[PDB]
Amino acid sequence: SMQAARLAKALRELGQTGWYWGSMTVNEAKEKLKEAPEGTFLIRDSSHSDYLLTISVKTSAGPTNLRIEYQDGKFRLDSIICVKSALAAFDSVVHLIDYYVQMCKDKVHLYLTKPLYTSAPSLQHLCRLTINKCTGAIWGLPLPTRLKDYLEEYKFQV
Amino acid sequence: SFEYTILDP
Amino acid sequence: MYVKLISSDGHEFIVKREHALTSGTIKAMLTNEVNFREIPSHVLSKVCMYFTYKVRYTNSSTEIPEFPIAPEIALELLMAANFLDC
Amino acid sequence: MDVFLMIRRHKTTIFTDAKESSTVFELKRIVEGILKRPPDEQRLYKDDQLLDDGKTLGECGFTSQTARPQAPATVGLAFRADDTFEALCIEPFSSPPELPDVM
Same domain? A46 vs A93: yes
A83-90 own/partner pairs: CB under 8 Å, 24+ apart: A83/B9, A84/B7, A84/B8, A84/B9
Provide the residue range defining the domain that includes C48.
1-86
Q: What is the resolution of this structure in A?
A: 2.7
Which of the residues D70, D98, D102 would you substitute to probe the A interface, choosing the one with the greatest number of A C-beta atoms within 10 Å? D102
The single-letter DSSP state of residue A133 is: T
Same domain? A10 vs A66: yes
Same domain? A47 vs A68: yes
Residue A76 pairs in a beta bridge with: A69
Name the structure determination technique: X-ray
Nearest to A77 among B3, B7, B9 (CB): B7
Residue A156 three-state SS: coil
Label residues C64-81 b or e (16+ Cβ within 10 Å = b): bbebebeeebbbbbbbbb
Per CB-CB distance under 8 Å, the chain C contacts of A144 are: 79
Same domain? A60 vs A8: yes
A91 backbone dihedrals φ, ψ, rounded to 5°: -70, -25
Closest approach of A50 to chain B, Cα-based (Å): 14
Per CB-CB distance under 8 Å, the chain C contacts of A114 are: 66
Q: Does A137 lie at the interface with C, CB-CB under 8 angstroms? A: no
Distance CA C18, CA A39 (A): 35
CATH number, position C35: 3.30.710.10
Tell me how far apart the 2 most distant CA atoms of chain C are, in Å. 38
Q: Does A88 lie at the interface with B, CB-CB under 8 angstroms? A: no
Q: Are residues A64 and B7, on separate chains, in Cβ contact within 8 Å?
A: no
The single-letter DSSP state of residue D34 is: H
Distance CA C4, CA C13 (A): 6
Q: Are residues A65 and B8, on separate chains, in Cβ contact within 8 Å?
A: no
Same domain? A56 vs A12: yes
Residue C2 three-state SS: strand
The structural domains of chain D, ordered by start, are 1-103 (3.10.20.90)
Burial of C41 (0-12, 13-18, 19+ CB in 10 A): buried
Q: Are residues C67 and A142, on separate chains, in Cβ contact within 8 Å?
A: no
Q: Are residues A79 and B7, on separate chains, in Cβ contact within 8 Å?
A: yes
- Number of folded domains in chain C? 1
Closest approach of D8 to chain C, Cα-based (Å): 9
Query: How many other C-beta atoms lie within 10 A of the C-beta of residue A149?
Result: 11
Distance CA A105, CA D96 (A): 28
Which of the residues C54, C64, C66 would you substitute to probe the A interface, choosing the one with the greatest number of A C-beta atoms within 10 Å? C64
